[PDB]
């Protein structure tokens, strides 16, 4: 029993969600903060990509994935910018195809950002654990992992847009995304959770290895500061969103729609902070900022 | 630097026999090897080829999909796996070495070959001279004709020459037109362009009497010419 | 160090005892050879791609 | 062409041997060795295992190549640039050369000559980033020498007793003050231990530190 | 006495210097004032040879102007085909520390040497098709800086022991030894007729040697620091030196003076390689500026630049026919400029 006949109004009214036909103080506030965050993301990533391309010094695979992170976060900024100018009363102008366009842009952008964070973690582990001095590196592994990230991001943003959604089971799907299913939200959130625990074990192995080997012979303070700030950005900008989605899909009668519009802003603030978390340490590249 | 091959002998038709050529005394791992067969009464005929490190394996029209050629670099051996021999495969199977790099001399060294007697778009090179009478101390010219312009774009006329003394393996004389092989006297010389070729001997002896061959290398399958025997 | 000095003095004495030509005439000779072989120089006059092996 | 097609096969067969040889040479560790003639570099080389001498030895699945370039006796200005990109520069100084003097000069100490060589090497434009391992040899002979002779003969200013522990400690810190690239290169100073065979183990630990710290540089985690 | 000979010796430098002024009638810059300029020399990278995994120090063209050799610290000697960019030979060296190359005029042999104080000679045309080492010329006590074949049997080498030598490859003994340099010898260049050769040393002097007699005919001074490269003019009546004073100078053998200095205020790094053009009108000099300049050899005007290398341009050679100029560098790449 599948229904693409109904409009957005049917889907919201089926769920607990509220259309908000009229403008609001809260709606104007979130539109202002969202457009501010999107402008910041777009500008900060243009600087990072321009610097990473203009300098011959920053022409190595690590900087390639850093520029890829800048590009993915710019794509996130664009997705959130388009989600704005489509909220509050504007959402009432949507159709099923267009709304799926909007949410698919969000899905692919954030999935790409998270996959880039995991790719940078995997690369740092490889670079640290090698036992050579120079190792003139190829551009093969970096472009291979760049296409895996983007292929996975596009397939993850398109799966609900095609097959994996509650066009067919009205009863069994989300409260916040009225059309994505509990199955899809569980999948996305466990994917992000296992990605975060993989980043946590890799950086713990890096810290343990550096500790043992160099203490056998300050770098410890710099390494622990960098590691703690990289995992902390992720935890304080994702754990909210992921626990909120798990609540939606697991607990009935947990009023979870209330803190949704701000938790998404936090998830995009993650991509806002990423260009400066991954460029503050590199004195040279940071100064290159002009 | 000798090359010796093993196998051959007498085989009933349809049987599958293997030819092994044990290279000894040179860098076998960096030599592209060939096989060339000569019928008991007829001229040479190319059959197979392997590049360096078994990167490229080619075959003749009459043996395509029937022969399998392999090399064992560590043991310095070359193998030929023959399947379902026909009555038209009776020939002496020489093994040839060749190395391809700027200015090299391919087909410079030929094995002694083995005798095999089974029980019972292609360039054509034409030379219509056979059993030509000649006397020692005179000047003799051997002419060859091709069906295609062997002069490549870069200016290399990939035409070779060979000399087979009676009861001996073929010996390279000229690895490209206006070039002279290693260990061959200055008397041999070759001048030609496009489809017309000549081989000029200034003064000869009893040592260089025998049959001469012409080969092109512009493209596979390296068709040979008929013999040109000097009569004395 | 007496030997090194003795070997030294005859070296310059041989070096001073050579015919020296005026730089005027030698200047012309370098001018003459460059202009005489100017038109055989690939790098001085660039050659069309038809006669350029690279 | 048929000939030209086979020619390109070689060029690819060549290139695959160069990569395999290049990746084998990249795993090898290149140590440059220096010091005075009587430093004990000869004695260090014996513990580890004309022209440029190469020593190959393996320790804990790591391959070391030590380039004893002491026998060149020519202008270092022309050929020292050949050694840019060594993992480390082993430097040997004999502590028992504080009261001595070179057989050629009148009263210019062997130890002060060691510093002049050290100053030019630690601050060489070719080794701006290169770490220095600094071996101080003949430490037990220095103990006997210092127990009878004063240390004032070499260093005119010295606040400290004729005790091995303090006498040596001044020299080590005196050698470590030669570099102006304090925050670019790390000097790992060791006192030579004969029987323990820890000299080779100290090289192991000093080399990994330079590798580990470097790995943290290029990946940005530093 | 020492002072008798010294006060004598400093006099002998005077007659040499006195006579050189008397023969300084007019500067080449004044004589070539009305020569029409060479014009902007735009030369583009035609071919780029990749396959070295370390810095290149040496390269040498073939007499057929098609093949060339290169050595690097990776301990590989590679014979290139410049037309098709494909490798003909990759020679492993016993010593990774190689500072020079030579490709024999017949192309049967190649020679390399460096800090190992040995000139190794490799045989190219070998029945068993694997470049084998023929001879090891071990008679020097310092690093070899240069080597140039005369014939398949005569090779002249310059070393860091302040001496040049002429060798006999069959016997492997120095037929002649050239002494008189007070500094480390850096490079040598053979005359077109292979009867004379000039050598540049770290003592800021170049000496003209005679290959048969083994005595130095003339000595040229004028530079301020090490002379790093040297080449004859095509006619063998002139030669040019590259020094660390960032100046190139054109000396004459007949007039026994200096003619030009090719200095530019912008340039402050040391010259690593120099080479001429087939007509002798262009002087290509490979600087430490990471780039390579092309000088008008009769006007002393920098007309053209070849900037394509990441690191310093170690070697720089032109073909016999002058159809190309190839430059090596520490960035591990050879580039063919035409
Ligand atoms: C589709 C699931 C992908 C995975 C979760 C993404 C995420 C993360 C952290 C907070 C939120 C989300 C999405 C929640 C829906 C998307 C939205 O835009 N909601 C807001 C909430 O107020 C209404 O938008 P609208 O109804 O006004 O157009």
Helix axes E2-22, C2-16, angle to 10 degrees: 20
Q: How far is CA D50 from the centre of its chain?
A: 20
| Same domain? B76 vs B140 | no
A104 is in an annotated binding site: yes
Question: HSE of E179 in the Cβ direction (CA atoms, 13 Å)?
Answer: 8
Distance CA E314, CA E307 (A): 13
> Which atom from ligand 1 is nearest to the alpha carbon of A245?
5
Looking up tokens 């630049």 gives E305
Give the distance from CA D87 to its chain's centroid. Answer: 10
Domain that holds residue B191: 125-229
Place of tokens 């903060």: A33
Structural domain range at position D67: 1-222
- Rounded CA-CA distance E195/E185 in Å is 20
| Interhelix angle D110-122/D164-176, nearest 10 degrees | 40
- For CA atoms D193, D198, D201, D206, give the dihedral sign: negative
Q: How many domains does chain D have?
A: 1
Q: Whose CA is nearest to atom 21 of ligand 1?
A: A261
**DSSP-derived secondary structure for A69-130:** HHHHHHHHHHHHHHHTTSSGGGGGG--HHHHHHHHHHHHHHHHHHHHHHHHHHHHHHHHHH-
Beta-carbon pairs below 8 A across chains C and E: 154
Q: Give the angle subtended at the CA of D2 by the CAs of C53 and D4, to the nearest 5°.
A: 35
CATH number at residue D54: 3.40.50.300
Helix (H, G, I), strand (E, B) or coil at E109: strand
- Judge: D82–E73 Cβ closer than 8 Å, yes or no: yes
Our answer on whether the CB atom of A107 is closer than 6 Å to any ligand 1 atom is yes
The pair of three-digit structure tokens given for residue B202, joined into one six-digit string: 């200034």
Instruction: Specify whether the CB–CB gap between E248 and E262 falls below 8 A.
Output: yes
* Resolution as reported, in Å: 3.5
Q: Do residue B27 and residue B58 come from a single domain?
A: yes
Report in angstroms the alpha-carbon separations of E75 from E56, E57, E95, E148. Answer: 10, 11, 6, 20
CA E279 to ligand 1 centroid distance, Å: 76
Question: H/E/C letters for each residue in E121-145?
Answer: EEECCCCCCCCEEEEEECCCCCCEE
How many residues in total does chain B contain?
232
Q: Are B47 and B154 in contact (CB under 8 A)?
A: no
| Angle at the Cα of E132 from the Cα atoms of E131 and E133, rounded to 5 degrees | 125
Residues in chain D: 222
Residue C20: half-sphere exposure toward Cβ, Cα within 13 Å: 21
Q: List, comma-separated, the residues after which chain D is broken, a break being a C to N distance over 2.5 A; otherwise answer none.
A: 49
Contact E231, E274 (CB under 8 A): yes
**DSSP string for C1-54:** -HHHHHHHHHHHHHHHSS----HHHHHHHHHHHHHHTGGG-TTTSPPPGGG---
Query: Which residue's alpha carbon is at the smallest distance from atom 1 of ligand 1?
Result: A177
E263 in helix, strand or coil? coil
Query: How many helices and strands (H and E) does chain B possess?
Result: 0, 20
Q: Could you tell me which residues come within 8 angstroms of residue E46 by beta carbon, excluding any fewer than 6 positions away?
A: C52, C54, E324, E336, E337, E338
Reduced to 3 states (helix: H, G, I; strand: E, B; else coil), residue E99 is strand
Backbone angles phi, psi at A142, to 5 degrees: -65, -45
Question: How many folded domains does chain C comprise?
Answer: 1
Which chains border D (3 or more CB–CB pairs < 8 Å)?
A: A, B, E
Q: Whose CA is nearest to atom 25 of ligand 1?
A: A87
Q: Which of E254, E295, E300, E319 to mutate to test the interface with C (most CBs of C within 10 A)?
A: E254
Which of C24, C26, C21, C32 shows the shortest CA–CA distance to E26?
C24
A283 labelled as ligand-binding? no
Which helix (H) or strand (E) covers residue E18, if one does?
Answer: helix E2-22
Of A77, A117, A108, A122, the closest CA to residue A188 belongs to: A108
Q: Cα of A264 to ligand 1 centre, how many Å? A: 6
CA distance E161 to chain D (A): 7
A 10 A CB-CB count for E295 gives 26
Ligand 1 atom 28: residue of nearest CA: A87
Q: In chain C, which residues have their Cβ closer than 8 Å to the Cβ of E2?
A: 1-2, 5
Q: Is D209 on the interface with A (CB under 8 A)?
A: yes
For A144, E182, E293, the CA distances from E190, given in Å and listed in that order, are 53, 21, 23
Structure tokens at B222: 């390296």
Cis peptide before B229 (omega within 30 of 0): no
Q: End-to-end alpha-carbon separation of chain E, Å?
A: 59
Tell me the β-bridge partners of B198. B143, B191
Secondary structure (H, E, C), A3-36: CCCCCHHHHHHHCCCCCCCCCCHHHHHHHHHHHH
Instruction: Say whether residue D9 is in contact with chain E using an 8 A CB cutoff.
Output: no
In chain E, what residues touch D77 (CB-CB under 8 Å)? 202, 226
Cβ-in-10-Å burial (0-12, 13-18, 19+) of E150 comes to middle
Residue of the CA atom closest to atom 12 of ligand 1? A264
Listed residue (E223, E224, E194, E206) closest to E164, CA to CA: E206
Chain E residues near residue B31 by CB distance under 8 angstroms: 129
- List the determination method: cryo-EM
Query: Is the CB of A245 inside a 6 Å radius of any atom of ligand 1?
Result: yes
Verify whether the Cβ–Cβ distance E129 to B102 is below 8 Å. no
Q: Which residues of B touch D6 (CB under 8 A)?
A: 32, 51, 56, 100
CB-ligand 1 contact for A263 (6 Å cutoff): yes
Interchain contact, E99 vs D79, CB within 8 Å: yes
- Report residue B226 as tokens: 């008929």
DSSP D55-112: EEEEETTEEEEEEE-TT--S-HHHHGGGGTT-SEEEEEEEGGGSS---SSSSS--HHH
Quote the longest CA-to-CA distance of chain B.
50
For residue A43, how many other CB atoms are within 10 A of its CB? Answer: 12
Locate the ligand 1 atom nearest the alpha carbon of residue A260 and give its number: 21
- How far is E240 from E249, CA to CA, in rounded Å? 5
Is-contact E144 E159, C-beta < 8 A?
yes
Q: Shortest Cα distance from D167 to chain E (angstroms)?
A: 39
Rounded-to-integer distance, Cα D107 and Cα B85, Å: 93
In whole angstroms, what is the distance from residue E315 CA to residue A77 CA?
51
CA atoms within 13 Å, Cβ hemisphere of E32: 25
Task: Kindly give the interhelix angle for A25-54 and A61-83, rounded to the nearest 10 degrees.
Answer: 160
Please state, in angstroms and rounded to a whole number, the distance separating the CA atoms of residues E93 and E134. 13
- CA-atom Rg of chain D in angstroms: 21
The angle formed by the CA atoms of residues B167, B169 and B174, to the nearest 5 degrees, is 125
**Both structure tokens of A3:** 């229904």
**Token match 């654990």: residue?**
A129
A8-288 CATH choice from 1.20.1070.10, 1.20.1510.10, 1.10.10.10, 3.10.129.10: 1.20.1070.10
What is the CB neighbour count within 10 angstroms for residue B7? 17
Q: Per-residue DSSP letters for A202-229?
A: HHHHHHHHHHHHHHH--HHHHHHHHHHH
Q: Do B3 and B41 meet the contact criterion of CB atoms below 8 Å apart?
A: no
Cα separation of D53 and A125, whole Å? 37
**CB-based contact E265:E222 (threshold 8 Å):** no
State the Cα–Cα distance between residues A149 and A157, nearest whole angstrom.
Answer: 12
User: A168 C-alpha to center of ligand 1: Å?
Assistant: 21
Q: Which two tokens stand for residue D157?
A: 């200013």
- SS3 assignment, position A50: helix
Between the alpha carbon of residue E90 and those of residues B106, B167, D17, D19, the distances in Å are 20, 39, 9, 12
Report the residue of chain D nearest A220, measured CA to CA: D222
Q: Determine contact: C11 vs chain E, CB below 8 A.
A: yes
Are D14 and E160 inside 8 Å of each other by CB? no
Say which residue the tokens 């004990």 belong to: D40
Number of residues that make up chain C: 54
The CATH number linked to B15 is 2.60.40.10
Token representation of residue E276:
């001429």
Q: Give all chains having 3 or more CB-to-CB distances under 8 Å with chain A.
A: D
> Is D113 within 8 Å of D102 (Cβ atoms)?
yes
**Residue burial E154-191, b: 16+ Cβ < 10 Å; e: rest:** bbbbbbbbbbbbbbebeeeebbbebebbebbbbbbbbb
B35 with B66, same domain: the answer is yes
CA distance C26 to D89: 52
Which of B32, B101, B102, B154 should one mutate to test binding to chain E, selecting the residue with the greatest count of E CBs within 10 A? Answer: B102
With a CB cutoff of 8 Å and minimum separation 6, the contacts of A63 are A52, A285
What length is written for chain A?
290
Domain boundary among B118, B135, B154: B118
Give CA angle at D74 (D69, D77), nearest 5°.
90
Is D41 annotated as ligand-binding? Answer: yes
Query: Residue E295 is part of a domain; what is its CATH number?
Result: 2.130.10.10
- Going E161 to E165 to E170 to E172, the CA torsion angle's sign is negative
Q: How far is the CA of A105 from the centre of ligand 1 (A)?
A: 12
Ligand 1 atom 24, closest CA: A87
| Chains C and E lie in contact, requiring 3 or more CB pairs less than 8 Å apart | yes
Is A259 within 8 Å of A244 (Cβ atoms)? yes
Pocket of ligand 1 contains residue A103 by CB under 6 Å: yes
User: For the residues of B83-121, what is the DSSP string, one character each?
Assistant: -S--GGG-EEEEEEEE--STT--SS-EE---EEEEE---
List, in sequence order, every residue forming a beta bridge with E295; answer none if it has no partner. Answer: E283, E302
Task: Say if the Cβ atoms of D2 and B218 lie within 8 Å.
Answer: yes
User: How many domains does chain B divide into?
Assistant: 2
Domain that holds residue E305: 2-337
Same domain, B113 and B22: yes
CA angle E26, E30, E34 (to 5 degrees): 140
Locate the domains of chain A by residue range.
Answer: 8-288
Please, are residues A83 and A64 in contact by the beta-carbon 8 Å criterion? no
Cβ pair E200, E241 in contact under 8 A: yes
Of A274, A127, E310, A228, nearest in space to D218 by CA? A127
Measured from the Cα of A17, ligand 1's closest atom is 26
The two tokens of residue A207 are: 């810290």
* Tokens 């790719």, located at residue: A119
Counting every residue, how long is chain E? 338
Quote the Cα angle for D98-D99-D100, to 5°: 95
The answer to whether D22 is annotated as binding is: no
């Amino acid at each position: 029993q599948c229904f693409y006949n109904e409009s957005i109004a049917f889907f919201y009214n089926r769920s607990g969600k509220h259309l908000a036909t009229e403008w609001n103080t809260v709606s104007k506030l979130v539109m202002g903060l969202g457009i501010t965050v999107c402008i910041f993301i777009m500008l900060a990533n243009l600087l990072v990509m321009v610097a990473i391309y203009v300098n011959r010094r920053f022409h190595f695979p690590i900087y390639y994935l850093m520029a890829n992170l800048a590009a993915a976060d710019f794509f996130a900024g664009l997705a959130y910018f388009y989600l704005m100018f489509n909220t509050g009363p504007n959402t009432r102008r949507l159709t099923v195809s267009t709304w799926l366009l909007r949410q698919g842009l969000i899905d692919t952008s954030l999935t790409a950002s998270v996959a880039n964070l995991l790719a940078i973690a995997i690369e740092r582990h490889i670079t640290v654990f090698r036992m050579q001095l120079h190792t003139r590196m190829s551009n093969r592994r970096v472009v291979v992992v760049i296409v895996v990230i983007w292929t996975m991001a596009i397939v993850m943003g398109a799966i609900p847009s095609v097959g994996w959604n509650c066009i067919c089971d009205i009863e069994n799907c989300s409260n916040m995304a009225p059309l994505y299913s509990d199955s899809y939200l569980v999948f996305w959130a466990i994917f992000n959770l296992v990605t975060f625990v993989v980043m946590v074990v890799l950086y713990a192995h890096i810290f343990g290895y550096v500790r043992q080997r160099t203490m056998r012979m300050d770098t410890m303070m710099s390494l622990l500061k960098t590691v703690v700030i990289v995992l902390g950005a992720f935890i304080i900008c994702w754990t909210p969103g992921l626990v909120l989605l798990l609540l939606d899909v697991c607990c009935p009668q947990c009023d979870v729609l209330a803190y949704e519009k701000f938790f998404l802003l936090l998830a995009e603030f993650n991509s806002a902070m990423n260009p400066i978390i991954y460029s503050y340490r590199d004195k040279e590249m940071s100064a290159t900022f002009r | 630097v000798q090359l010796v091959e093993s196998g051959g002998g007498l085989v009933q038709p349809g049987g599958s026999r293997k030819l092994s050529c044990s290279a000894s005394g040179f860098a076998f791992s960096s030599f592209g090897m060939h096989w060339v067969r000569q019928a008991p009464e007829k001229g040479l005929e190319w059959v197979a080829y392997i590049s360096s490190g078994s990167g490229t394996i080619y075959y003749a029209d009459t043996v395509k999909g029937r022969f399998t050629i392999s090399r064992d670099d560590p043991k310095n051996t070359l193998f030929l796996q023959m399947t379902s021999l026909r009555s038209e495969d009776t020939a002496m199977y020489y093994c040839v070495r060749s190395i391809y790099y700027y200015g090299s001399s391919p087909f410079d060294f030929w094995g002694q070959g083995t005798t095999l007697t089974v029980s019972s778009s292609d360039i054509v090179m034409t030379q219509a001279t056979s059993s030509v009478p000649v006397t020692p101390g005179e000047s003799v010219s051997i002419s060859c004709r091709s069906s295609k312009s062997l002069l490549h774009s870069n200016g290399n006329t990939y035409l070779y020459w060979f000399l087979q003394r009676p009861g001996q393996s073929p010996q390279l004389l000229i690895y490209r037109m206006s070039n002279l092989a290693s260990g061959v006297p200055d008397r041999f010389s070759g001048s030609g362009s496009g489809t017309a070729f000549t081989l000029t001997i200034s003064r000869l002896e009893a040592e260089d009497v025998g049959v001469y061959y012409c080969m092109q290398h512009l493209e596979y399958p390296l068709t040979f010419g008929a013999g040109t025997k000097l009569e004395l | 160090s007496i030997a090194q000095a003795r070997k030294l003095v005859e070296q310059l004495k041989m070096e001073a005892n050579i015919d020296r030509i005026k730089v005027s005439k030698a200047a012309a000779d370098l001018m003459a050879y460059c202009e005489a072989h100017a038109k055989e120089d690939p790098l001085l006059t660039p050659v069309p791609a038809s006669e350029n092996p690279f | 062409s048929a000939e030209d097609k086979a020619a390109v096969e070689r060029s690819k067969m060549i290139d695959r041997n160069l990569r395999e040889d290049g990746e084998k040479a990249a795993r090898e560790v290149k140590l440059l060795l220096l010091g005075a003639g009587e430093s004990g570099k000869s004695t260090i080389v014996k513990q580890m295992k004309t022209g440029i001498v190469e020593t190959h030895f393996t320790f804990k699945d790591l391959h070391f190549k030590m380039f004893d370039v002491g026998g060149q006796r020519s202008e270092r200005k022309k050929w020292i640039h050949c050694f840019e990109g060594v993992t480390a520069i082993i430097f040997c100084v004999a502590l028992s050369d504080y009261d001595l003097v070179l057989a050629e000069d009148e009263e210019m100490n062997r130890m002060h000559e060691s510093m002049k060589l050290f100053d030019s090497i630690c601050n060489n434009k070719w080794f701006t980033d290169t770490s220095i391992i600094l071996f101080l040899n003949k430490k037990d002979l220095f103990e006997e020498k210092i127990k009878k002779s004063p240390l004032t003969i070499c260093y005119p200013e010295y606040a400290g007793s004729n005790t091995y522990e303090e006498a040596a400690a001044y020299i080590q810190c005196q050698f470590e003050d030669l570099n102006k690239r304090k925050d670019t290169k790390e000097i790992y100073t060791h006192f030579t231990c004969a029987t323990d065979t820890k000299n080779v183990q100290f090289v192991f630990d000093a080399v990994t530190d330079v590798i580990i710290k470097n790995n943290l540089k290029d990946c940005g985690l530093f | 006495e020492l002072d008798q000979l010294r006060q004598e010796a400093e006099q002998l430098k005077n007659q040499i210097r006195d006579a050189r002024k008397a023969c300084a009638d007019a500067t080449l810059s004044q004589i070539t004032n009305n020569i029409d300029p060479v014009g902007r020399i735009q030369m583009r990278t035609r071919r780029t040879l990749r396959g070295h995994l370390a810095k290149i120090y040496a390269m040498h063209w073939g007499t057929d102007s098609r093949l060339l050799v290169s050595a690097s610290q990776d301990g590989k000697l590679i014979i290139w085909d410049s037309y098709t960019t494909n490798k003909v030979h990759a020679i492993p060296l016993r010593s990774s520390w190689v500072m020079t190359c030579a490709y024999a005029p017949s192309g049967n042999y190649v020679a390399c040497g460096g800090l190992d104080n040995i000139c190794s000679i490799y045989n190219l045309k070998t029945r068993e098709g694997n470049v084998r080492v023929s001879r090891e010329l071990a008679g020097h006590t310092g690093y070899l800086s240069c080597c140039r074949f005369l014939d398949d049997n005569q090779i002249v080498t310059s070393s860091g022991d302040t001496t040049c030598a002429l060798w006999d490859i069959e016997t492997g003994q120095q037929t002649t030894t050239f002494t008189g340099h007070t500094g480390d010898v850096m490079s040598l260049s053979l005359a077109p007729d292979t009867r004379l050769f000039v050598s540049g040393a770290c003592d800021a002097s170049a000496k003209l040697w005679d290959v048969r007699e083994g005595m130095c005919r003339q000595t040229f001074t004028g530079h301020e620091s090490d002379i790093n490269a040297i080449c004859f003019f095509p006619n063998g009546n002139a030669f040019a030196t590259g020094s660390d004073d960032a100046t190139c100078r054109l000396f004459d053998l007949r007039a026994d003076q200096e003619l030009m200095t090719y200095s530019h205020d912008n340039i402050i790094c040391g010259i690593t390689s120099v080479s001429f053009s087939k007509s002798g009108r262009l002087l290509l000099a490979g600087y430490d500026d990471f780039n390579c300049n092309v000088w008008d050899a009769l006007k002393a005007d920098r007309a053209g630049v070849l900037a394509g290398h990441d690191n310093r341009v170690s070697c720089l050679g032109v073909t016999d026919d002058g159809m190309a100029v190839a430059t090596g560098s520490w960035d591990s790449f050879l580039k063919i400029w035409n």
